[PDB]
Amino acid sequence: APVERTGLIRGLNKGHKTTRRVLKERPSRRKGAQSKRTQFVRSLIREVAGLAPYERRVIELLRNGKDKRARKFSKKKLGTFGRAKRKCEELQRIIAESRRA
């Protein structure tokens, strides 16, 4: 039972009193989970293919450059700030690995 309801409508924990059971996770909910082979295949394919032109531009703006410029450019390229920040984190990991290899 996550949280027990107050038994009255119009409240912070409103709702009818039921003993809420915790249940095992359905296999659909695993969709975003990472796996060993997927990780292996994606890393090998990244090694084989390299970077995109916009990814190279972002990396150049990231190392010896401006993070606000990188953020703005990444958002312009990808369309969404969440995707832009995830891409910037991934390219930061790439830069760190390349520089500390």
């Binding site: 082979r37 292996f40 090998l44 394919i45 090694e47 084989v48």
Partner: protein
Amino acid sequence: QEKKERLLREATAIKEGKKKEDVSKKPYTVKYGLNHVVGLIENKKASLVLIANDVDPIELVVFLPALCRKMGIPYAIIKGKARLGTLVHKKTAAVVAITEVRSEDKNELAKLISAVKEGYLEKVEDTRKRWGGGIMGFKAQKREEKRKKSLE
């Protein structure tokens, strides 16, 4: 025909009541098929890999040298997709892997692996990293030669 004969003798065996895989022994054969070979080198069972140099959609094999390097398995890009095919009784094979051999030619396998390593991989260790040439045509090459000779 060999498979039919083996199945026939296994049939006589289990008609006599002797269990299967008693008349026949463990087979040692070369491994083919792209997905099968990829799985073998992923599980490190492959001892040597030969990749055809002329796979129409190179994509199917463009990652194979990198995969073999990552998994630490000796590979060689060999000439003849049709050659691998006729080796394996198909039209084409596009990839071939050898995992285990019999003891009478384990020494031959070791010799082949060492020779392939030191005579292909060590020589291509550097040339595999550079871009394919932008070679011009015959007349363009002659024009550039004339230009350089006139300049000097």
